[PDB]
Amino acid sequence: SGNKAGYFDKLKGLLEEYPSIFVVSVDNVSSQQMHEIRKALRGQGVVLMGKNTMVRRALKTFMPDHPEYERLLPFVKGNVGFVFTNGDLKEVREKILSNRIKAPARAGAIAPVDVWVPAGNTGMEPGKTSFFQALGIPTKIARGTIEITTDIKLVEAGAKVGPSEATLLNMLNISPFTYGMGIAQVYDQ
Amino acid sequence: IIEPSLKALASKFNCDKMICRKCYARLPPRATNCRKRKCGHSNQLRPKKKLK
Amino acid sequence: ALKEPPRDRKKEKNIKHNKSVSLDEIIEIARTMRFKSFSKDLKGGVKEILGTAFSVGCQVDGKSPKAISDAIEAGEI
């Protein structure tokens, strides 16, 4: 547990030097997203999150270095990380909000909102018509391109997406999911 | 011929089993002790070998 | 590319482990092309990486690529 011991001194060393601490609620986000935001904020500020700190901040609350830690004691519930930076709070309000990825469906993901395909020309190879015939979508091949004459409802809002439609959604580059950084309440603002 | 998923479903009930080495009893795949009393709940089990 | 002499044809049928190369600033110069593609802070980690990358070659003479990368005593550039 060498890294376990190494975490303690890093947390206590880092908390005292930086007067501003920002709380981030990150959940089910791809590793590459944290990689890119880490490289983007490499020059200014260091981001680090870990396991729940049941007593590791309570020990800093016992001694008087920061009487305001015990005000922040109840704020930790789960999957909440901390960001240590020296920039202004106004400038960091929207700094970490960049690079919202377009998450594809996962073969049954619940769509919060009704998903519709606008009228247009798909333009792909007409060998894929078996996929359309699986769902029974009225499609006409024009100039070697599959065209949907009439809009067909894909899945109702809040209902499980069909596996065939979900697979077609990947190559259609349309999805109801947009994953991005979550901003939590900080310092009772 | 049998489509692969049905063949797997049928194989689940009569191919993936454990065999006791004392009374030749059929046991679940993850079992560790025979359930019959005439072998003394022995723990000498071997997998049922597949057909090939 | 550095390898050893030329990898003449019809010679790779047998063992082809004769690819020993020198360990010097030539590899550090070649590291600038990569230029710490994956983070590596100011590229010190990339310098150690590229130095220990030729672990099969075992650096040159007594020195080893792993020992050279492990010993943080050389200049940054």
Binding site: - | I1, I2, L6, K7, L9, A10, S11, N14, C15, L51 | -
Partner: protein, 191 residues
């Protein structure tokens, strides 16, 4: 080593009614009524809160304490069955000889019975009659599906096992002859 106090609780939704007398449980709700007799187990029942049933054992042994979770799950299954019902699905698997079934309707009483013909190309006509309260359907959703549905898990499952156990191959290598009828899915009627 005897444990002084062991207790468990069951929440109850605001849809059904339950009454117990002499360790005999009666559960009745929107989809019907069920009965169970538990006179063979020494358990103390109580009403913990407005919608929670508690049950417990005092000074029990390890073997006696073991049955407490079994009782809890049986009554919970009764609650599930009376508020959502049960539904099993089964599939037919044959290689050469198709197997034909005939689920004729009620035979002047509530019991259903299913007739099976042409198993591994056999001319036996074989008949099994299920317990009352189980409804059998031939699926129209897709091909070669049998649907069993009902209120009680024990009866639905037992009838399905009767169907599974009646189609057996004798004097043959069963790793090669995979002919038969097998169960494939378990779930509730609603959702």
């Amino acid at each position: 080593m005897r444990y002084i106090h062991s207790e468990e609780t069951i929440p109850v939704p605001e849809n059904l009614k339950v009454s117990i007398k002499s360790r005999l449980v009666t559960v009745e709700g929107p989809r019907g009524k069920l009965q169970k007799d538990l006179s063979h187990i020494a358990v103390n029942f109580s009403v913990v809160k407005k919608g929670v049933i508690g049950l417990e054992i005092h000074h029990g042994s390890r073997k006696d304490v073991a049955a407490l979770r079994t009782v809890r799950t049986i009554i919970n299954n009764m609650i599930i069955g009376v508020t959502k019902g049960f539904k099993y699905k089964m599939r037919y698997v044959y290689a050469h000889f198709p197997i034909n079934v005939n689920v004729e309707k009620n035979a002047e009483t509530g019991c259903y019975e299913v007739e099976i013909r042409n198993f591994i190309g056999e001319k036996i006509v074989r008949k099994v009659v299920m317990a009352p309260g189980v409804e059998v359907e031939i699926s129209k959703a897709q091909k070669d599906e049998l649907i069993l549905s009902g209120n009680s898990l024990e009866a639905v499952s037992q009838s399905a096992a009767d169907i599974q156990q009646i189609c057996k191959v004798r004097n043959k290598d069963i790793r090669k002859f995979l002919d038969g009828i097998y169960v494939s899915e378990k779930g509730n009627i609603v959702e």
